[PDB]
Ligand SMILES: O=C(NCc1ccc2sccc2c1)[C@H]1CCCN(c2ncnc3nn(-c4ccc(C(F)(F)F)cc4)cc23)C1
Ligand SMILES: O=C(NCc1ccc2sccc2c1)[C@H]1CCCN(c2ncnc3nn(-c4ccc(C(F)(F)F)cc4)cc23)C1
C-alpha cells in the first residue's frame with residue numbers, strides 16, 4: 047500500500063493552491079445536522095493502525111507516485127520535495143496530530159468527532175491530503191449507528207412482549223458477506239455491526255477486531271450451523287423431507303437454521319416440519335432449537351403465516367405479558383428483505399397479532415452492510431482554521447443555496463453542558479474554560495498511535511440507555 | 515495474509531455434512547436474474563478475484579490450523595472440515611480443484627443469462643464449489659458499477675449527439691469522484707476500475723494500479739485527471755478573498771484545464787461578478803486545450819446548472835452550433851459534481867436541451883451515486899446450484915419458491931449461445947451438447963489453481979462499447 051497514491055487526484059495539486067506562508071491547516075470531521083439523531087463513533091483506530099502509523103513514506107513509494115502522477119496528469123505536478131522532506135526529517139512518519147472522541151461514544155449530530163492538523167509548518171498541505179483516507183470513517187460509523195438504531199427497535203418490542211431483554215444481542219444477524227463490495231468492506235462493516243450485536247456470518251470481522259481492537263473472549267461474534275438452498279435442492283424436489291431429516295439429525299445437539307422456502311414454505315412448515323418430521327423437532331433441547339427460515343415473499347405476511355401455521359402444529363404457551371410463544375425447541379429467523387424500515391413493520395405486526403419477539407430473530411445482508419451512503423449521516427470533513435503569515439483565521443464555507451452545508455469555524459473543542467449534554471465550541475472558545483475540559487483525546491501524533499480502545503470498551507460505550 | 519478458509523459465510527463451513535451422501539459433483543452458476551430497466555449487463559471483475567484470492571497455493575497447514583481454532587470458538591463446536599482441506603493440501607499442493615467457465619470480460623449480456631459456472635474437478639471436493647460462492651458473488655459489484663456507468667454513458671451519448679452532432683469527448687463526460695464516498699480502499703480500486711471500462715476520467719487513483727496489476731493496458735494509464743480546487747483551498751484565503759484564491763489558482767495552472775469550485779459563499783455571485791467581471795481577463799485569454807471549468811457544488815442540480823449557464827451566457831460570448839444549440843467559448847466549461855446519479859443526470863441533460871444548451875458545455879462528476887449507492891438487488895445477481903451428481907447419476911436441481919416466481923433458478927448443465935437473430939440464449943439441461951446453437955461462449959478461465967485465460971483491459975473496453983459508438 048502506498049499512501050502517496052491513496053488520495054483524490056486533485057489533492058496532489060493542492061500544495062500550490064494555499065495562500066503563501068501558510069504554516070497550519072486544521073480540519074475537523076462531523077455528522078452534520080428514524081431520524082438518526084446520534085451517531086456511534088467507531089472505525090478510526092482501524093485506519094490509524096492499518097494506513098497511517100509508522101514509516102509510511104519510502105524512496106520507492108515517492109518514485110512510484112511520481113511516475114503514475116506524471117502520466118495521470120500528463121504533467122509533473124507531484125510534490126516530490128514535500129514528501130522527501132517527511133522521509134528525511136521524520137523517517138517517513140507523518141507529522142500530523144489527530145484528536146478524537148473515544149470510540150463507541152454516542153454523540154448527537156452536529157458535533158466535532160475528530161480534528162486533524164499538521165505539527166510541522168512545512169507540511170501544511172498534509173492535513174487535507176489524508177482527508178480521503180480519514181473520511182472513509184463514515185462507513186464504520188454509519189454501519190454501527192444504523193445497527194444500533196435497529197437494536198433500539200428490537201429492545202422496545204422485546205421488552206413490551208416479553209418483559210426483559212434476554213437475547214437482544216443475538217436478534218440481528220449479519221448476512222452481508224456476499225452482498226458487499228469487497229473483502230475489506232466485509233471485515234470493516236461486520237466489525238461495526240458487532241459493536242451492537244454478537245451474531246455474524248461474516249468471518250472477516252472477527253480477525254479485524256482481534257488485530258486492531260481486541261477482546262477478552264476468544265471471538266467477538268458467533269454463528270450456528272445452517273442450510274442453504276444448494277444443500278436442500280441438491281436432494282431433488284421430491285426429497286426435501288429427506289434433506290430436512292438429514293440436516294437436523296447431523297446437528298441434533300446444536301441450534302440449526304434450515305431454509306424452508308425452496309419450493310413451498312407453507313407446505314414445509316405444516317406438513318414436513320409439522321407432521322412428517324415433528325417427532326425430530328419436539329425431541330430437541332432448549333439449547334439447540336430448530337430455527338425455521340423463510341427466505342421469500344412479503345416479509346411481514348410470510349412471518350405471520352409461518353407463525354400461525356406453527357402455532358397450530360406445535361404447543362403454544364402464553365407468556366407473562368399475554369404474548370404467544372413457541373416451545374423452546376422451535377424458533378424463526380427472517381433473513382430476507384430486512385432493513386431498519388421493514389424490521390420495524392415486522393415486530394409491530396407481530397405485536398398486533400399477540401406474538402412475542404422471543405419467537406423471532408432477524409438476518410440482514412445488503413441493508414445491514416451495503417445500502418448505506420455518506421449522505422445518510424452527512425459525514426463531512428472541512429477545514430476550520432489556518433495560520434497564514436503567523437496569524438490564524440477562522441475559515442468556513444457558507445453556500446447560499448444550502449444552509450445545511452455551512453461549516454464550523456476556528457479551533458474546535460467538545461464539552462459537556464451543565465445539563466450533561468454535548469456542545470462543540472468554535473473559535474477556540476474552549477480555551478476560556480467555561481465548559482470544562484475538552485472531550486477529544488490525542489489519538490495520533492507524529493506517526494504513532496497515542497491512545498487506543500479495546501473492543502470491549504467500545505461495546506460498553508455504545509450500549510443503549512434501556513440497557514443501562 | 516489472506517486466508518481463503520476464513521473468507522466464506524460462516525454456515526458454509528457446515529455444508530459438507532448436508533449434501534446427499536454419495537455426491538461427487540456440485541455445479542453452480544451465476545446470473546443477473548430477470549424481474550432505467552438495466553436490460554443488459556457488462557461482465558467485468560472476475561479476473562481480479564481469480565488472481566487475488568483463488569489462484570495458486572491457497573491452503574497451508576498453518577491456515578488449516580488457524581481456521582480450525584477460530585471456527586471452534588465461533589460455532590462453540592467442532593464442525594470445521596479439516597479432513598477435506600488437508601486433502602486439497604496433500605493432493606494438489608494447496609491448489610483448488612475447481613473449474614470456472616465464463617463469458618469474456620467486457621461482454622454485454624441481456625438479463626437472465628449464465629455469466630459463469632463453477633464445479634469441482636475432484637469427487638472428494640464436492641463441497642468446494644459453493645464454499646467459494648461468497649468470494650465469487652462479490653463480482654456483482656464491478657458488474658453493477660460497469661453496467662450503471664455504461665447506462666449513464668448511453669444517456670450522455672444520446673443527448674450529446676442530439677445537441678452537438680457527434681460524440682467528441684463522450685468518454686470524459688462522467689468523472690469518478692467516489693474515492694471518499696465508498697466503504698473501503700479495496701472497494702475504491704475495484705469500483706473505479708469498473709468505471710474506467712466506459713470512461714477515462716477518475717480521481718480515484720487506486721483503480722489505475724488495480725488495472726495495471728490485474729488486467730493491463732497498452733497506454734501508461736487507464737484514467738486521467740486535471741488540477742482542481744476544493745473548498746479548503748478556497749476558504750483558506752478568507753471570506754473577503756475568494757477573488758484572490760480564484761486568481762491565484764487559475765494562474766498557477768495557466769497551461770492545463772483547471773476546475774474551480776465556486777459555491778463556497780455565493781455561486782451566482784462568483785460567476786457573474788468574479789469570473790464574469792473581476793477576473794474575466796484571466797479567463798478569455800485561456801487556451802482551448804486548457805479551459806476554466808466552473809464547478810457548482812450545491813443547490814438543486816438542474817436549477818443550479820441552468821442559472822449558472824444563463825449567467826455565463828450573458829458575461830461571455832456564446833455561439834450557436836450547427837444543431838441550433840448554445841455553446842460557451844472554448845475556454846469556459848462547467849462540471850456538475852454534486853447530487854449526480856443516473857436519474858439526476860437524465861434530468862439535467864434533458865433540462866439543458868429544453869433550454870437550448872449543448873451538452874458540449876458540461877461534464878458530470880459522481881461520487882456516491884457512481885460507486886457506493888448500488889446493491890446486489892439492482893441487477894438481481896445470484897449464484898445458485900443447478901446440477902449435482904449423486905450415486906453416479908446427475909440430476910437437475912433448482913429452487914422454485916411459491917411466493918416468488920422471480921426467485922426460480924435454472925436447471926442442469928448450462929451453456930451460452932448466439933441465436934440465429936444474433937441475440938443470446940442460455941441452454942439448460944445439457945442441451946448445448948446437441949450443437950444446434952453453435953459454440954458455447956463460456957471459456958474455461960480457471961482450472962485446478964491456474965488462471966487459464968485472461969483478458970487485457972483494452973479488450974474489455976472494446977467489448978463494452980456502445981452500439982452508437984460502433985456505427986460512428
Ligand atoms: O436461547 C438461546 N439460544 C437459542 C435461541 C433462542 C431464541 C432464538 S430466536 C431465533 C433463534 C433463536 C435461538 C440463548 C443462547 C444464545 C442465543 N440466545 C438468544 N436469545 C434471543 N434471541 C436469539 N436469537 N438467536 C439467533 C439468531 C440468529 C441465528 C443465526 F442462524 F442467524 F445465525 C442464530 C441464533 C439467539 C438468541 C440466548
Ligand atoms: O481539450 C479537451 N477538453 C477540454 C474540455 C471540454 C469540455 C468540457 S466540459 C467539462 C470539462 C471540459 C473540458 C480535449 C482533451 C480531453 C478532454 N476532452 C473533452 N471533450 C468533451 N467533454 C469533456 N469533459 N471533460 C472533463 C470532464 C471532467 C473533468 C474533471 F476532472 F474536472 F472532473 C475534466 C475534464 C473533458 C472533455 C477533449
Ligand SMILES: [Cl-]
Nearest residue numbers: 225410411412
Ligand atoms: Cl441480501
